[PDB]
Structure formats: C-alpha cells, structure tokens
C-alpha cells in the first residue's frame, strides 16, 4: 500500500535524450492518476484507451513510464499511427496503444543562452523503429556506396544531432518534457 513514485519521473532534474529514452517500471503501489490530470500544468494529456478519470478505478500488472525531451512541434508524433523523425527513428508508439501521453513546456529548464546541446535525437536511420524500440548506436551512417570506416565526411554522417535549445526559440522549437504511461495486478488506484 505504498505510493507509486511518479514524482521522481515527472520531477526529475534531467530528462533523457529521446533516442536514449528512459523507461521506469511501476509495480506494487497505488497510483492517483487524478492528481496528475488535475494539476493543470500540462499542455498535453491525451489518453488512448480509457479516460484518466476512469482508469483511477482500474488495476494493471505493470505500468511503464517512459520519459524524454523533444521539440514542441514533435509532440504530435508521440501518438499511435504517426510518422516523422521522432516516431520513425527515436520513439515509436504501436497502433494499438492503450496508455496516456503527457507533455509540458520546459523552456525554463532545458534551454540556455547560447544553446543547450545536452539533448540529442537520431536524424539518420536505415529503417523505421518497431514500437517501443530503443536504438542507442553511434555507428556512422553510410549515405552513399562507399563504406565510412567510422569517420565522418561526405556521405558519412554521425547519426545523432543535438537540439540547440535556446530560450529565444519559437514555441514549436522549444523543449518539451514528455512522459508516456503504458498499461499492460500490482498497480491500482
């Protein structure tokens, strides 16, 4: 009868880069999903599968909490059936997703003058990611027919790019912290 440690997911001092997205397993606790919803501090709280007011009256065996940072424009890609740089090459949700997606603007925390380059994303990949796949390789991307041999150059690109989060960015280009809750019984409300 312990409380689920959502505070250490939502209030972590740093978030992961989206390509190396962080996953926390939630088990053996009671979760108040209605304090998360009724916080009124989130810009996105879209649930796929069941309403948040109603899943407080529900139990699951495990809950996964995935967290990362992306651009505000890319939050729309954190949904079933989406395409784009994030959904294709960084974090992919399945078509039959049955959880909740939560996001909020973190320009005050993840941007700095001159640019915060901590947060990375994958720009090049040979194919799309499977749902809930995490690709953390730094192999040089071969964009032509000549092998790269682990050094950059023409047709040989480092696959990861840094966001350049500056506070003067337009909102769509500002950093947003994202939490994805997957539901698959040791977790109740």
């Amino acid at each position, epitope marked *: 009868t312990n409380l689920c440690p959502f505070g250490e997911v939502f209030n972590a001092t740093r978030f992961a880069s989206v390509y190396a997205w962080n996953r926390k397993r939630i088990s053996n606790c009671v979760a108040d999903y209605s304090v998360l919803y009724n916080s009124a501090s989130f810009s996105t709280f879209k649930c796929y599968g069941v309403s948040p007011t109603k899943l407080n009256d529900l139990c699951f065996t495990n809950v996964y909490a995935d967290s990362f940072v992306i651009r505000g*424009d890319e939050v729309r890609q954190i949904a079933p059936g989406q*395409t*784009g*740089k994030i959904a*294709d*090459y960084n974090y992919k949700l399945p078509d039959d997703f049955t959880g909740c997606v939560i996001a909020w603007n973190s320009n005050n925390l993840d941007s700095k003058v001159g*640019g915060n380059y901590n947060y990375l994303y994958r*720009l*090049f*990949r*040979k*194919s*799309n990611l499977k749902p809930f796949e995490r690709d953390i390789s730094t192999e040089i*991307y*071969q*964009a*032509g*027919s000549t092998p790269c041999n682990g050094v950059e150059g*023409f*047709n040989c*690109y*480092f696959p990861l*790019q840094s966001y*350049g*989060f*500056q506070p*003067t*960015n*337009g*909102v*769509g*280009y500002q950093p947003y912290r994202v939490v994805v809750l997957s539901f698959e019984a040791t977790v109740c409300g």
Partner: antibody
Amino acid sequence: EVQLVESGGGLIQPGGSLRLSCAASGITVSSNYMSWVRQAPGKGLEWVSVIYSGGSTDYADSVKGRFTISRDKSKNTLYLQMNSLRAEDTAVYYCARDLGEAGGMDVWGQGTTVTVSS
Amino acid sequence: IQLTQSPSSLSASVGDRVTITCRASQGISSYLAWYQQKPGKAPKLLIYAASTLQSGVPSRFSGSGSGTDFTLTISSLQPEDFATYYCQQLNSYPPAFGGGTKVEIKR
C-alpha cells in the same frame, strides 16, 4: 561522378498527369532524405515533397492529394507522380538530397521544366 | 515561420564587401542555410547551420547569426559572385525560403 539527372518534364493540360524521374549517381536514394523543390517563372524556391530514408513521405499543402513521391532501389531513382495538374504547378522542378540540419540540400539536379496550360 | 530577406537587390563593385540579411519571424537558433543561384542554373549550397562553410565554397563567403537575425557576408566580391542568394530554414518540413537577394553590378 556525384550527380542527379532529371527527366520527365514537358507540356501538359490542366487536370493531366506527368511523372518526373531523378536518377542518382554517387548517393544512395533509398538511404537519404530526398526532396523535390520547384521554382515558378520569375519567382523563388518552394519545397514540394520529401521521402525519408525509412520511407515516410511529406508534402506541401498545395500539393497533397495530387502528388506522390516514391523511389526505386534497383534503379537508384527518385520519382514524383503529378496528378490533377494546375496552372500554378508550372515551374522548373529540382530534385535534391536533403541533409537537413547536418548539411543542407547539397546535391541538386539540373532541373526539369513543367508547363501546365490549356 | 517566415523568412524575410533584405534587400531585394543590391548593387556592388568587384572587391566590395557585401552583406545580405535574413530575418526569421520567431527564432530558429542556427537552423539556416544560404544558397546561390545564377540564371538558368540550379541552386548551389554555400553555408549551412548559419555559419558552417560548405566544402569547396571560397572562404570569402561567411555566415553569422543565431535566433532571428542572420547575415551572409562576401568579404571581397568577385566577378562570379553576381547572382541571386536565398536563405532557407533547416529542420522543418514545410521549409521556409527567403524571397531572394539579387547582387547586381554597380555603375
């Protein structure tokens, strides 16, 4: 050696169809972001379409539902299928490899001309 | 995002210092590219990431800026530099292009 050679442009009537080809040498079409960019007579540049290395596609709004971008790995060739052409679509069309933030559009085709007129 | 190039055209002499500016409507950090286009020819990439010189491009070209104000500078104009120049937003499909700047011969 590194080049993009385009063809398929020509005269066509409103509502008609046309297919542009972009045959590549020195870059691998199916491994890259490949873009089409057009330039109407006396005007600037306008992006038309992109196909990702992973197969995802995107289009400018004035072109959605009429244009289809695709590629052939065996021929290392990029295609743009243009349906329901309008007079506005009259332009020189360029294919280009797109590196986005990691470079820009660094390899360009020579361009092919599309005239839509009754 | 909209990109506003200034001026629409400018006249200069060989050896002059030429400055072309691009103003973004919101703030795009360093996601900016500069292209050169001559009549009848395809665009040619000069600079990406606002200030990185494309390989093979002469060093008299340089880019500066981050945020909303960007500049293309030709330190000593050469005869083959008379052409039209375009800025382009990077990292955004529907990418925005500037309206272009024509560099013409002064007399």
